[PDB]
């Protein structure tokens, strides 16, 4: 029943800090941008377990640092924020963030082992409050993208592995939030009921694990929490921001046995409207800014926290048309270019986010 974001400070991980200080700052001479970059490096965004190698290295290192700070007397205690993101046939409706594992090459077994190892590590660090986002985009793709061969082919696997993860990571010091797309994906009137059906059924089939707190929205996207008028690209969706989406979604979930609490990514939501020409333009969108800083003080009963899940500056996908992971969304007129591989540092993007930051740095 506890909000896992209440009574703790959020740990800012050293990986994002290191990117900003070793890659970004040496390329930013401008005094104000340099000072702003140093400040954003300290905003506590989620750390992503995007490859298996990170489990026994980066995850352990962060948890070990938090343990040490808390043992020294940190008040409030620090909590960790981790994304689980390595399903086989990952990112099934796009090319940009295809992952290391494939269902056709022992991916299911590889993933179960990854989840088992994460469980063992979280058990060993049961003294550290841990908040998890489970597999961005996965279930949202199962709602709207069964017409995509990679997604339809992965659906049964996604379902089995999601339930596996929810049960295995159901630990006394863990809070989990399943990814649930965003207002412009699942919040469309035609998608929102089948979305609620799917998430509630997964929840029931997982045995309603205690550690499942709810859902995460807007991960790696740009939507407003709350604006007074719909951005043009949102019409005619009545759920044109995350507040509308959540207020519509929660009753439908609760009626199906899943009284989900929410966290909302605001890391790239500071400038509204954005420069997106169409709402479905997700890749390195121009006209965006760093948004509201992580906090549990949301003013909304259904929202545990505003968070930064996607770390701004880390690319959404390459704009190189010859690359294996080239996705046409990343070559569009409203995608910033040239852009490196997904997850790699995109310094010009980082600068855009600093310039447009609201609140400013």
Ligand X SMILES: CO[C@@H]1O[C@H](CO)[C@@H](S[C@@H]2O[C@H](CO)[C@@H](O[C@@H]3O[C@H](CO)[C@@H](O)[C@H](O)[C@H]3O)[C@H](O)[C@H]2O)[C@H](O)[C@H]1O
Ligand Y SMILES: CO[C@@H]1O[C@H](CO)[C@@H](S[C@@H]2O[C@H](CO)[C@@H](O[C@@H]3O[C@H](CO)[C@@H](O[C@@H]4O[C@H](CO)[C@@H](N)[C@H](O)[C@H]4O)[C@H](O)[C@H]3O)[C@H](O)[C@H]2O)[C@H](O)[C@H]1O
Q: Which is nearer to ligand NAG, 35 or 113 (CB)?
A: 113
Asked whether the beta carbons of 148 and 92 are under 8 A apart, the reply is yes
Categorise residue 327: left if φ over 0, alpha if ψ from -120 to 50, beta otherwise: beta
CA–CA distances in Å: residue 28 to residues 34, 85, 268, 335, 346: 6, 31, 20, 22, 13
By a kind-dependent CB cut-off of 5 to 8 A, residue 55 interacts, out of ligand Y, ligand X, ligand NAG, none, with: ligand NAG
The per-residue DSSP string of 199-217 comes to HHHHHHHTT--TTEEEEEE
Please pick, from the candidates 45, 77, 97, 356, the single residue that binds ligand Y as defined by CB under 6 A. 97
Nearest approach, Cβ of residue 56 and ligand NAG (Å): 4
Asked whether the beta carbons of 19 and 228 are under 8 A apart, the reply is no
Per DSSP, 12 falls in state P
Query: Could you give the string, one character per residue 32-71, with x where binding to ligand NAG holds by CB under 6 A and - elsewhere?
Result: --------------------x--xx---------------
By a kind-dependent CB cut-off of 5 to 8 A, residue 94 interacts, out of ligand Y, ligand X, ligand NAG, none, with: ligand Y
Please pick, from the candidates 45, 47, 221, 298, the single residue that binds ligand Y as defined by CB under 6 A. 221
Nearest approach, Cβ of residue 216 and ligand NAG (Å): 25
Among all residues, which ones are annotated catalytic? Answer: 137, 316
CA–CA distances in Å: residue 274 to residues 28, 181, 223, 351: 24, 18, 8, 15
Please pick, from the candidates 5, 50, 63, 304, the single residue that binds ligand X as defined by CB under 6 A. 50
Residues in the interface with ligand Y (CB under 6 A) total 19
Query: Could you give the string, one character per residue 114-143, with x where binding to ligand NAG holds by CB under 6 A and - elsewhere?
Result: x--x--------------------------
In angstroms, the CA 336 to CA 338 distance is 6
Alpha-carbon dihedral sign for residues 146, 149, 151, 157: positive
User: Phi/psi of residue 153, each to 5°?
Assistant: -70, -30
For the chain, give the longest Cα–Cα distance: 54
Q: Which stretch binds ligand Y (CB under 6 A): 8-16, 63-71, 122-130, 178-186?
A: 178-186
Q: Is 91 in the site for ligand Y (CB under 6 A)?
A: yes
Count of helix runs (H) and strand runs (E) in the chain: 9, 8
By a kind-dependent CB cut-off of 5 to 8 A, residue 182 interacts, out of ligand NAG, ligand Y, ligand X, none, with: ligand Y
Q: Which stretch binds ligand X (CB under 6 A): 27-35, 51-59, 239-247, 323-331?
A: 51-59
Q: Which is nearer to ligand Y, 26 or 189 (CB)?
A: 189
Q: Is 85 in the site for ligand Y (CB under 6 A)?
A: no
Asked whether the beta carbons of 139 and 178 are under 8 A apart, the reply is yes
Determine the distance from the C-alpha atom of residue 140 to the mean position of all C-alpha atoms in its chain, rounded to a whole number: 13
User: Which residue number has the CB closest to ligand NAG?
Assistant: 52
Contacts to ligand NAG by CB under 6 A = 52, 55-56, 110, 113-114, 117
């Amino acid at each position: 029943n506890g909000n896992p974001f209440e009574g703790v400070q959020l740990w800012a991980n050293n990986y994002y800090r290191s990117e900003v200080h070793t890659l970004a700052i040496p390329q930013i001479t401008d005094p104000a941008l340099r000072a702003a970059a140093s400040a954003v490096a300290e905003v506590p965004s989620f750390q992503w377990l995007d490859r298996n190698v990170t489990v026994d290295t980066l995850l352990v290192q962060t948890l070990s640092e938090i343990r040490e700070a808390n043992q020294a007397g940190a008040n409030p205690q620090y909590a960790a924020q981790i994304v689980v993101y390595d399903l086989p046939d990952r990112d099934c409706a796009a090319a940009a963030s295809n992952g290391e594992w494939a269902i056709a090459n022992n991916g299911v077994n590889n993933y179960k082992a990854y989840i088992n190892r994460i469980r063992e590590i979280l058990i060993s660090f049961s003294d550290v409050r841990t908040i998890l986002v489970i597999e961005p985009d996965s279930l949202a793709n199962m709602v709207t993208n069964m017409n995509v061969p990679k997604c339809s082919g992965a659906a049964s696997t996604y379902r089995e592995l999601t339930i596996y993860a929810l049960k295995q990571l159901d630990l006394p010091h863990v809070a989990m939030y399943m990814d649930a797309g965003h207002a412009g994906w699942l919040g469309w009137p035609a998608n929102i009921q089948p979305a609620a059906e799917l998430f509630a059924k997964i929840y029931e089939d997982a045995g309603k694990p205690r550690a499942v707190r709810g859902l995460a929205t807007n991960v790696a996207n740009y939507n407003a929490w709350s604006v007074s008028s719909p951005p043009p690209y949102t019409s005619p969706n009545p759920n044109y921001d995350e507040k509308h989406y959540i207020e519509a979604f929660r009753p439908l979930l609760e009626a199906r046995g899943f009284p989900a609490q929410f966290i909302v990514d605001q890391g790239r939501s500071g400038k509204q409207p954005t420069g997106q020409k169409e709402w479905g333009h997700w890749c390195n969108a121009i006209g965006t800014g760093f948004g509201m800083r992580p906090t549990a003080n949301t003013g909304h009963q259904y929202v545990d926290a505003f968070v930064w899940v996607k770390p701004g500056g880390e690319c959404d996908g390459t704009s190189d048309t010859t690359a294996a992971r080239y996705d046409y969304h990343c070559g569009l007129e409203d995608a910033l270019k040239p852009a490196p591989e997904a997850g790699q540092w995109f310094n010009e993007y980082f600068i855009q986010l600093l310039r447009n930051a609201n609140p400013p740095f």
